[PDB]
């Protein structure tokens, strides 16, 4: 009640260490153990909360690994002080994890902080708790109890950060670290719940990663398929391996077509490339109304011709906007090459035939929807206008864009890769990619509950929730439980047993 909690802890440490040698020289061994028992009651006995809540969490936040190990000793010797240690420090885990994801204004940085708290608690176990396992039990319990509460802020932020770690830079060439931080991704986000939204978003992420730019590594994606195969269903990693098999099918079609133009001897500059896919293992894509230069339409018909062979049973529903393409660009003061997107490639295709178009037939002769075309003009316009030049300036954009293509263009590099768009995405794009999972759980829980009542006739709702939580990779809301109860009654697999929702039957 005079010194600080760490000061009193060091005093207790040294004062207990005093009482040994008293016996060692002169006092009695058989009263050494009564002496330490009494003294440890006098110092540490009956003070296992006012030392061990604040002065625990205070010196954990200060993270003095010497005194944390000291109190670990000083409360692993004592009568039961490690129980107070486990409870106070585990509540400390829950709250000091909870100081991340419940913050809706602070979603720009969540994943790195989660990695940080994971790292800190791991280090406090491995030295400050000296690889005891009770602490690990409280850790995992506390983490899962925490993240059952917010499922679909983290898994989406986590998916974006997983994709961010799946980028090809010049800074990283040791994928071993990215293997190790990938191991931390798997282990740490096994605490994070709602994995179906992460799963579908990772379909979106491999789409946005292959379709523009290039991945961090081949073995990185292979290791992720093998790792995410674990901890989820074995029919939950059928689509991803289907992605890479469909990519190999498209490459084999590429080899076949290149061999079939080996005797036609292409020397022309105009290229067509379609990597074709099936809708069972990929994100779904529906064509949107867009306008194509008629030679591209000729290439579409060529694509039909080479499409109709090789496992016929095939019928066109084409996409002609989702790729990125390399293009040479005429300007004054040099001819450099652009790596750009099809939304912008059509823009640049019209800025060959003339300079002087306006947003009316830029809206029309592209055909591009408003949501895509605004963000198309947020790249290389709304700033840095030396290729396209848009009459509204700044973040605010009005419907009056007047364009005259610029002769002037300056940069110090070749292969001018100015392409945010397809390695970016919009808010309602993310929201819609979430709703394609929201009322997609419907058939999942439908199948699960029809199988349950086909297995056990009576099951209260507080047990249906637990069987579903056992079975599924995401947490099911109480609203969705009412939703499936009512729809099962609509399709005659439930009857309310005893005229209340307490129990049910499988009678129609």
């Amino acid at each position: 009640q005079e010194r600080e909690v760490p000061e009193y802890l060091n005093h207790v440490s040294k004062r207990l260490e005093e009482e040994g040698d008293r016996v060692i020289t002169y006092l009695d061994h058989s009263t050494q153990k009564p002496l330490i028992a009494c003294v440890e009651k006098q110092l540490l006995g009956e003070h296992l909360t006012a030392i061990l809540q604040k002065g625990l969490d205070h010196l954990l936040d200060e993270n003095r690994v010497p005194d944390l190990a000291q109190m670990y000793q000083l409360f692993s010797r004592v009568r039961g002080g490690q129980q107070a240690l486990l409870q106070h420090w585990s509540e400390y885990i829950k709250t000091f994890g909870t100081a991340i994801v419940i913050n809706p204004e602070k979603d720009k940085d969540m994943v790195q902080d989660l990695l940080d708290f994971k790292d800190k608690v791991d280090h406090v176990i491995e030295v400050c708790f000296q690889k005891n396992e009770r602490f690990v039990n409280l850790m995992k319990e506390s983490f899962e109890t925490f993240i059952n509460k917010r499922p679909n802020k983290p898994a989406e932020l986590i998916a974006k950060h997983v994709d961010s770690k799946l980028r090809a830079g010049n800074k990283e060439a040791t994928d071993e670290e990215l293997e190790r931080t990938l191991d931390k991704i798997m282990i740490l986000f096994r605490f994070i719940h709602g994995k179906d939204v992460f799963e579908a978003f990772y379909k979106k992420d491999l789409a946005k990663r292959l379709l523009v730019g290039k991945s961090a590594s081949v073995d990185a994606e292979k290791s992720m398929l093998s790792k995410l195969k674990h901890e989820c269903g074995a029919a939950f990693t059928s689509k991803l391996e289907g992605m890479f098999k469909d990519m190999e099918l498209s490459k084999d079609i590429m080899v076949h077509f290149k061999q079939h133009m080996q005797n036609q001897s292409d020397s022309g500059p105009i290229d067509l490339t379609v990597n074709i896919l099936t809708m069972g293992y990929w994100p779904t894509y529906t064509p949107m109304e867009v306008h194509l230069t008629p030679e591209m339409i000729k290439l579409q018909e060529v694509f039909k011709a080479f499409y109709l062979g090789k496992h016929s049973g095939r019928k066109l529903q084409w996409q002609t906007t989702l790729g990125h393409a390399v293009l040479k660009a005429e300007f004054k003061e040099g001819k450099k090459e652009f790596q750009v997107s099809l939304f912008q490639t059509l823009v640049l295709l019209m800025f060959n035939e003339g300079d002087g178009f306006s947003f009316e037939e830029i809206k029309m002769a592209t055909g591009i929807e408003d949501s895509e075309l605004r963000r198309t003009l947020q790249s290389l316009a709304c700033g840095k206008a030396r290729v396209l030049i848009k009459s509204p300036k700044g973040k605010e954009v009005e419907d009056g864009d007047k364009f005259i293509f610029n002769g002037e263009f300056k940069h110090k590099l070749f292969r001018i890769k100015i392409n945010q768009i397809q390695m970016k995405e919009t808010v309602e794009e993310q929201v819609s990619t979430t709703e394609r999972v929201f009322q997609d759980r419907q058939y999942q829980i439908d199948a699960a509950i029809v199988r349950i009542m086909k297995m056990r006739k009576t099951l209260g709702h507080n047990l249906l929730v637990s069987e579903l939580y056992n079975q599924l990779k995401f947490p099911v809301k109480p609203g969705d439980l009412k939703k499936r109860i009512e729809s099962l009654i609509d399709r005659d697999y439930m009857e309310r047993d005893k005229d209340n929702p307490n129990q049910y039957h499988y009678v129609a």
Partner: peptide, 21 residues
Amino acid sequence: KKRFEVKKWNAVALWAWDIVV
């Protein structure tokens, strides 16, 4: 020949079903 001379068009797309449900 043009202000962008066409060197590469590349696309990703889906091959679709053709059997009755």
